[PDB]
Structures are given as structure tokens and as C-alpha cells.
Design a protein around this nucleic acid. Structure first.
Lengths: 215, 225
RNA sequence: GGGUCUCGCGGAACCGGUGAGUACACCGGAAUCCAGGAAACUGGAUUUGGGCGUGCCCCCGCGAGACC
């Protein structure tokens, strides 16, 4: 008995002073009870717009909402520094409610290539039977980045995880760690460990390598 | 003034139960509808359930129907979410929020509590192992070296990481934790520093994990010979 | 008597719309009767309590009862 909203885009890069538009399409319901919320990391959402176009008391009037058929739009007429956040649309009917998938509004800046570093496992970790290799992409923009692990020139699949910092509050860059996890037995069976980084700020991909047991 | 305060969150194993409470202050829930919305770590908002406390009318997301029961007690000005047959996918911050009027309206969810954390897992509490991310032998990108600590195999969240007892903050990046297939969490914390200081300055990462009552200091030095 | 409760009997059919937020206010098709016309139609009179999860609920009138 659920209803559905399709929100786009998932992410957008903007500058202070830009006009910003975010859209949600209703699938099943035609209820005009559509609201928009702002959420910042670690905080509860805050109401901005309700009933598709009414501005909530206390909300700056640069926020506005509109409807055209099944399409609902949140507009920020002139983006302010405190407006970089995630935004959610929401639809209710008598019994069900639903939320769109969210849009993160991040800070646009100049393209910045990452600084890449690779870390072999410590001798301490190896005593417990597991090995973690870590690749660090430091202070790059934009967020999109590809990291590929190769062990003895063989491409790895399924034994790595990554995570990314929030955009830096002073230079607006991202940083990323990719951790490759092997058993101690597997790790000692191979020699060359490398991560290959693909990023818009690199003409060709960058590789950082080490040989197991080297200086 | 107006307050919604959620409580009752905590750790439970898969298949177990929890009862959340949402206590309102400064308004009567009988004049509103009350809604539970949850947010899994790193994910979007998901509507869970709704109730019209003046009438007892309830509604549920398909993902929780038959396992969750929403209820309200207007004399105590409190709403509840009984959660049975919990699964790992139910791990989330659970928010309570209100909408003006006793039955349906087109008002928004104009006030939200700060939420209560629900963690569904079979993992046992465990303090992390802390391993050095040793700086490399070549003076790396830009006459600056990169070093860090790997904070591995702990449960539950969170850990707190500092460097040099808080004396070193600039250039530090502590990454968000990832949940491994083991059910344990792992993360790294890194910092970039001048290459010319690796012989003079010592770098120590301080890792605290309150649920295990553990505190770890790990000197990170260049690896030798 | 007045409050809560409970039970019984009543409160034209169908479709759609506006504004609410409860279970209300309103509007158009429409229906029934009369008259006119060969017909398409036209004029006059009269007319249904509501909510949404559509099978359950709220409300109104009448009757019976229980408890303060």
C-alpha cells in the first residue's frame, strides 16, 4: 500500500549565489501534500516547504516550492553557505507516507588531483593471521574516483572496501581510503601490491606500489 | 517549549524486540499526528509508521508490517513503537515527528526529535586492534609524508581517534567506519606532515572505545631495516 | 435532569469536483414528478448526513437499558 517519490539528482555541485533546483516525481499518488526537508550531518531534518508551495514559518524566502503535474520542485534562488546540505522530498496521503531518495548539495571548486599513498600491513597485524593494505587518496575534487587493486598484476575483485570523508570545510576537497584485506597466507604468496587511481584531475591513471619485504 | 524526545534505543540481537517511546512536551499529541521515520547509517529517510492519537488509526510501511506496532497514550502524551522480530536491516536512527491536526492534513512534519539509535546485531562487544600505517621511505607527494593508524575489528560503534593527545589536528582525516562481513567495524585515521619532521617529531594516535572500556595509544614510526 | 456507555429502529441510487481535517461546509452532473417538442432538447417543482483504509467507522433523530 506504499506510495513512491523519485528524486533527482542524487548530488549537485553549486556555488554561493547560484540558483538550485531539485525535483521529485510522484509515481502512484496525486496528493499535493508534498513537503521538503533539509538535513545536515548528525542532525534531525528540518521542514522547509509544505503543501507543495507553502513556506514554513522561520524559513528564509530564498527557498520556494512549485508543482507541475506529477513533478514537484524545490528552488533555492541564491544559494547561501549554510544551505550546503542534503534535501528530501516527502509525500503523504491519508495513511501512507514516503520520502524521496535525497539530493546532496555540495560546494563546487576547481579540479584537484589526489595525492596517492599506499601502506603495507604492519608486522603486528600479520601475527594475527590477516593482512590489510591501505591506499589513500588525499584532498581531491570532484568526489568521483576509481581505485583498482592489483596483486602481482592480477586485478582484485571483492576483497576491498572504501570510505570517503565529507567535503573539507576549508579547501572543499574529499579524501578516500581503500582497504584491501587478505589472509596472511595469501599475502605472503605474492610480491607486488599496487593500487591504480583514476580521477578527472589525472591525465592517465596513477599507480603506487610496493614489493612485500622491501626497504 | 515544543519537544519530542525519543528513547528506548539500544543493542538487540536479530529476532529480538525493542519498544521505543516518543514523549511530547509543550503540545498535546491529540492535536497532531505522530510519525516514526528511520535513517540507516549513510542512507536516506524511510517512513516507518504513522498514528492519529485522537483516533487510534495506524499505518505502516510494507517493510515493517506485521512486525512493528505503533501506539499512543494521550494521557501520558507519549507515542510508542513496539518492534518485534528485528533484523539487521532495521539498524537505524529512529526519529519521531509531528504533523498539525488530529486527522489528515497537508501540513509538513514540522518538528522532529533528535532520534534514538537502534542496532540489531549478533556481534559481541569487542575493542579494536590498532595498527600503524607507517610513513613510506621516499619523501612523498610534496615534501610531505602520510601516516596513520588502522582501527580494526571493533563492535559496536563508535570509536574516537585523536593524534598527539589533540595537539595535532590539521591535516587529519579520520574516515567513516565500514561494517565488515564479520559484523565488526573498521576504519583508518591518517595525517600528512612535513617530511623533515619524521626524525624529530613523534606521532601517536589515541583510540578510545567506550563500550569495551578500552583505550589505546599507538606510536606510528617509520619502518626500519 | 445531565453526563458517559450499551442495544434496537430510522436517516433515496449512481458519478465527479472545491476547501478543510476529520467524520464538516459547499458545487456540478443526476434522479423523481409535471409541462412543451417528431426528436436532439427546454422550462417548472421536488430530492439523499458524513470519513476513508469500501466495509468498517463517525454523526443526527426516535426507543430501551446500565452506571455515576
Amino acid at each position: 500500500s506504499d506510495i513512491q517519490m523519485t528524486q533527482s539528482p542524487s548530488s549537485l555541485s553549486a556555488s554561493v549565489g547560484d540558483r538550485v533546483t531539485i525535483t521529485c516525481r510522484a509515481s502512484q499518488s496525486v496528493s499535493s501534500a508534498v513537503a521538503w526537508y533539509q538535513q545536515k550531518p548528525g542532525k534531525a531534518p528540518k521542514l522547509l516547504i509544505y503543501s507543495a508551495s507553502s513556506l514554513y514559518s522561520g524559513v528564509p524566502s530564498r527557498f520556494s516550492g512549485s508543482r507541475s503535474g506529477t513533478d514537484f520542485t524545490l528552488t533555492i534562488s541564491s544559494l547561501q553557505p549554510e544551505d550546503f546540505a542534503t534535501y528530501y522530498c516527502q509525500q503523504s496521503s491519508y495513511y501512507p507516507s514516503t520520502f524521496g531518495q535525497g539530493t546532496k548539495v555540495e560546494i563546487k571548486r576547481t579540479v584537484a588531483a589526489p595525492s596517492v599513498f599506499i601502506f603495507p600491513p604492519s608486522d603486528e597485524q600479520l601475527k594475527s593471521g590477516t593482512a590489510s593494505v591501505v591506499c589513500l587518496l588525499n584532498n581531491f575534487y570532484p568526489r568521483e574516483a576509481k581505485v583498482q587493486w592489483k596483486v602481482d598484476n592480477a586485478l582484485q575483485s571483492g576483497n576491498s572496501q572504501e570510505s570517503v570523508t565529507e567535503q573539507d570545510s576549508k579547501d572543499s576537497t574529499y579524501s578516500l581510503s581503500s582497504t584491501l584485506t587478505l589472509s596472511k597466507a595469501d599475502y605472503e604468496k605474492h610480491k607486488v601490491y599496487a593500487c591504480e587511481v583514476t580521477h578527472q584531475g589525472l591525465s592517465s591513471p596513477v599507480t603506487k606500489s610496493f614489493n612485500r619485504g622491501e626497504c | 517549549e515544543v519537544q519530542l524526545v525519543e528513547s528506548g534505543g539500544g543493542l538487540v540481537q536479530p529476532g529480538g524486540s525493542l519498544r521505543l517511546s516518543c514523549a511530547a512536551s509543550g503540545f498535546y499529541i491529540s492535536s497532531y499526528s505522530i510519525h516514526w521515520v528511520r535513517q540507516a547509517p549513510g542512507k536516506g529517510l524511510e517512513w516507518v509508521a504513522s498514528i492519529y492519537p485522537s483516533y487510534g488509526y495506524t499505518s505502516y510501511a510494507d517493510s515493517v508490517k506485521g512486525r512493528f506496532t505503533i501506539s499512543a497514550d494521550t494521557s501520558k502524551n507519549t507515542a510508542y513503537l513496539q518492534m518485534n522480530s528485528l533484523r539487521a536491516e532495521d539498524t537505524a536512527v529512529y526519529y519521531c515527528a509531528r504533523r498539525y491536526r488530529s486527522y489528515y492534513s497537508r501540513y509538513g512534519f514540522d518538528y522532529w526529535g533528535q532520534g534514538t539509535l537502534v542496532t540489531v546485531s549478533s556481534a559481541s562487544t569487542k575493542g579494536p586492534s590498532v595498527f600503524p600505517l607507517a610513513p613510506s621511505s621516499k619523501s612523498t607527494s610534496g615534501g610531505t609524508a602520510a601516516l596513520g593508524c588502522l582501527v580494526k575489528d571493533y563492535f559496536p560503534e563508535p570509536v574516537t581517534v585523536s593524534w598527539n593527545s589533540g595537539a595535532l589536528t590539521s591535516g587529519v582525516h579520520t574516515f567513516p567506519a565500514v561494517l565488515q562481513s564479520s559484523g565488526l567495524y573498521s576504519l583508518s585515521s591518517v595525517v600528512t606532515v612535513p617530511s623533515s619532521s619524521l626524525g624529530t617529531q613523534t606521532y601517536i594516535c589515541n583510540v578510545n572505545h567506550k563500550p569495551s572500556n578500552t583505550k589505546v595509544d599507538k606510536k606510528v614510526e617509520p619502518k626500519s631495516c
